């Protein structure tokens, strides 16, 4: 679909989840935008 989906520098309508706490079950949808926290320090919703 390169001739259709591609638009200039990118298309924000198509997004993916780069990180997740665990493995989602098959056909499981979770649109939560909670920041991924790998350590014990609270992220407070900001990267770091």
């Amino acid at each position: 679909s390169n001739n259709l989906d591609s638009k200039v520098g990118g298309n924000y309508n198509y997004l993916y989840r780069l990180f997740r706490k665990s493995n989602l079950k098959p056909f499981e949808r979770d649109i939560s935008t909670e920041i991924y926290q790998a350590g014990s320090t609270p992220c407070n919703g900001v990267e770091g």
Binding site: K25, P26, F27, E28, R29
Partner: protein
């Protein structure tokens, strides 16, 4: 119950004569409808008139 996002519903309707506690007997529930919703359920609530 929910199976891979499919919510199964079973229903049964039979007359009874009860005062308190529970009746003594046997029954089976037939399928009513299939709801392919796909939302996780962790709690439920009851509605009364």
């Amino acid at each position: 119950k929910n199976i891979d996002g499919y919510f199964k519903i079973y229903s049964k309707h039979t007359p009874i004569n009860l005062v308190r506690d529970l009746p003594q007997g046997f029954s089976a529930l037939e399928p009513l409808v299939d709801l392919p919703i796909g939302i996780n359920i962790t709690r439920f609530q009851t509605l009364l008139a």
